[PDB]
Amino acid sequence: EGREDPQLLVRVRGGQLRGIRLKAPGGPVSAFLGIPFAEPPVGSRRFMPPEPKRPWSGVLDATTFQNVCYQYVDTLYPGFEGTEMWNPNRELSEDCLYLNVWTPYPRPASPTPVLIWIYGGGFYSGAASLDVYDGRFLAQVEGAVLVSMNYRVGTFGFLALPGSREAPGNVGLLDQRLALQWVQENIAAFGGDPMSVTLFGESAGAASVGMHILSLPSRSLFHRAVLQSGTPNGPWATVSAGEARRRATLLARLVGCNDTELIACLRTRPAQDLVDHEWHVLPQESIFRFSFVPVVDGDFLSDTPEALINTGDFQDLQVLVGVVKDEGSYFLVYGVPGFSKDNESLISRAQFLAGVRIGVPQASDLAAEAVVLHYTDWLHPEDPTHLRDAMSAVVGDHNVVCPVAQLAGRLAAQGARVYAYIFEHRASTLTWPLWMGVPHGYEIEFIFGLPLDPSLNYTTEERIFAQRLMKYWTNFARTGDPNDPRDSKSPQWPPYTTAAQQYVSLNLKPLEVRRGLRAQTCAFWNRFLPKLLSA
């Protein structure tokens, strides 16, 4: 040391780190970027569970984001901001198990509650280093300690030959948990309070939070949870062991290969070869379906999430859960014919029927019919504008709105304190067409407080609005309650109950309380459809 900033140097269990002093709009923050938390899961460690990071010598530099985990890159609208913002923004590498810490500057005085972010990306993509996951605003304005980790995605994180020892599955959830432990042991060196750790994530990230709630070894690593537009239950977040085994075998032939010999072969293929063939193993033409996701292994997941949700005891749990207005519109342009970001995607009755089989790829001819009958507007059963929005509503409801409604309903009936929201404000800065509404993933820039960056051309109310949600999210982190301890003038946010089924709307207007989580339509998806599909 010597001439360095004395407040940027910190020790953790593996060595010394030098952070970096970043500017937030209202003051500096401390950032420790690219801390390793595991041995690089490369070579013979590919598909294996992560081992803890061996201690290093000297001062590790912790001032830039590390590699993002090896993953598919989106190429359907090259150069379009609406897709590039989610694409990797550092080098792709299998050496990628690193995490980031933002704290106030100088680091806080008392022990400060910790926020751990788990990104989404359908378990095949994502990075903790994207701009929309920037922690400097939450750390500066709310004084939070924010931690986000990289976990392995796609084949590297979730290809499983269940019951084998060289590919047990769920290693990407283990990656997440190892970062959670790392927070338990080390977050105190930054001012964070390991006794107040709140997980929050979106899409596959929310599902991940969900699975840490349902996996006993993870439950001693956090206290509160937030699930944004994602659930461990539902049709896309998990696969049986048999189905997981099926895809791993198929992918091994697609690249040219007793489980040991086969995994040994896969470990010789270039990472890009596996990415290149990852989507070819899906059983049907589908949207919102991902090849390699958490497997129900009888280990991390002792049973299916629906089983565990339906029976577990959750009185110690406090969760915030919610959805955006138009969860499914985003996914239509990635597979349903008739949809594009560039025209207005008015479709025909025929195209709606074809789309229902792609959006519900597991539906029998009869079940597919039920969906078509329930979602048709029988006064205008061929208005192409309404069949487009109905296609959007089918996919959104089936994959998010009703898996979340279902989860909120079970946890509430089983002891948990649930707070539920719908996010309805559509960012002025947004580059997707208007017909897509408020698409999947577009609350995140507001929770993280990006509109407080004046260089981002948001609007003033969008600024004020983002502070409102940062306050909601951090108050829930501190206390289990998003309501402000003081602020009694602004309206209150009731817990969600079986009785009153209350939830709030989040938009530029004050909190408005509503009832019913798409109650009628989710009864179709969560009660009738299962019984129909055993036939």
Ligand X SMILES: O=C(COc1ccc(-c2ccccc2)cc1)NCCCN1CCCCC1
Residue 207 vs 522, nearer CB to a second copy: 522
Query: Which residues between 349 and 388 bind a second copy (CB under 8 A)?
Result: 366, 369-370, 373-374, 376-379
Q: Please give the full DSSP string across 89-121, using - where no structure is assigned.
A: -S-EES---EEEEEEESSPPSS-EEEEEEE--S
CB of 214 to ligand X, least distance (A): 23
CB 237, CB 207: distance < 8 Å: yes
In whole angstroms, give the CA distance from residue 221 to residue 208. 14
User: Residue with the closest Cβ to ligand X?
Assistant: 441
**Which of 202, 278, 306, 327 is labelled catalytic?**
327
Q: For residues 336 and 370, which CB has a smaller minimum distance to a second copy in the complex? A: 370
**Which region, judged by CB under 6 A, interacts with ligand X, from 44-52, 55-63, 119-127, 451-459?**
119-127
Smallest gap from residue 127 Cβ to ligand X (A): 11
How far apart are the C-alpha atoms of 31 and 145, rounded to whole Å? 10
Compute, in degrees rounded to 10, the torsion defined by CA atoms 402, 408, 413, 414. Answer: 120
Which of 123, 288, 432, 503 is in the footprint of ligand X by CB under 6 A? 288
In angstroms, the Cα distances linking 256 to 78, 157, 273 are 30, 20, 10
- Residue 218 annotated to the active site: no
C-alpha span between 394 and 385 (Å, rounded): 14
Binding span for ligand X by CB under 6 A among 98-106, 264-272, 328-336, 400-408: 328-336
Assigned token pair, 153: 């995605």
C-alpha 244/C-alpha 298 separation (Å) is 13
Stretch that binds ligand X, among 120-128, 138-146, 370-378, 496-504 (CB under 6 A): 120-128
Q: CB-based burial of residue 193 (10 Å sphere; 0-12 exposed, 13-18 middle, 19+ buried)? A: middle
Q: Which of residues 160-219 bind a second copy (CB under 8 A)?
A: none
Q: Is 330 in the site for ligand X (CB under 6 A)?
A: yes
| Choice between 509 and 515, CB closer to a second copy | 515
Residue 234: DSSP 8-state:
S
Stretch that binds ligand X, among 100-108, 186-194, 329-337, 361-369 (CB under 6 A): 329-337
Sheet strands side by side (includes 417-423): 20-24, 27-36, 98-104, 145-149, 112-118, 192-202, 224-228, 318-324, 417-423, 502-506, 512-515
* CB 224, CB 198: distance < 8 Å: yes
Output 195 or 373, the one with its CB closest to a second copy. 373
Q: Would you say the C-alpha torsion 283, 289, 290, 292 has a positive or negative sign? A: negative
Pick one of 249, 467, 501, 507: the residue that binds a second copy (CB under 8 A): 501
Q: Does 56 bind ligand X (CB under 6 A)?
A: no
Q: Which of ligand X, a second copy, none does residue 19 bind (CB under 5 to 8 Å by kind)?
A: none
Q: How far apart are CA 282 and CA 286, in angstroms?
A: 8
Measured between alpha carbons, how far is 504 from 512 in angstroms, rounded to an integer? 5
Q: Least distance (Å) from a second copy to the CB of residue 356?
A: 14
| Ranges within 411-440 binding ligand X (CB under 6 A) | 440
Closest contact distance (angstroms) between CB of 128 and ligand X is 14
Give me the least distance between CB of 139 and ligand X, in Å please.
Answer: 23
Nearer to a second copy, 109 or 535 (CB): 535
- The catalytically annotated residue of 440, 443, 445, 462 is 440
Residue among 137 and 330 whose Cβ is closer to ligand X: 330
Q: Which of residues 350 and 464 has its CB atom nearest to a second copy in the complex?
A: 350
Q: How far is the CB of 360 from a second copy (least distance, A)?
A: 15
Task: Return the structure tokens found at 446.
Answer: 């507001």
Residue 327 among the catalytic residues = yes
Task: Return the range that interacts with a second copy (CB under 8 A); candidates 191-199, 308-316, 318-326, 525-533.
Answer: 525-533
Residue 378 partner contact from a second copy, ligand X, none using kind-dependent CB cut-offs of 5 to 8 Å: a second copy
Neighbours of 293 (CB within 10 A): 26
Phi–psi pair at 133, nearest 5 degrees = -100, 20
Element (H, E) at 263: helix 259-266
Helix, strand and coil in the chain, % to nearest 5: 35, 20, 45
3-class SS at 405?
A: helix
Cβ nearer to ligand X, comparing 19 with 205: 205
279 near ligand X (CB under 6 A) = yes
324 Rama sector, left if φ>0, alpha if ψ -120 to 50, beta otherwise: beta
CB of 332 to a second copy, least distance (A): 23
CB of 504 to a second copy, least distance (A): 16
Stretch that binds a second copy, among 181-189, 318-326, 455-463, 514-522 (CB under 8 A): 514-522
Residues taking part in catalysis:
203, 327, 440
List residues near a second copy by CB under 8 A.
366, 369-370, 373-374, 376-379, 501, 515-516, 519-520, 522-524, 527-528, 531-532, 535
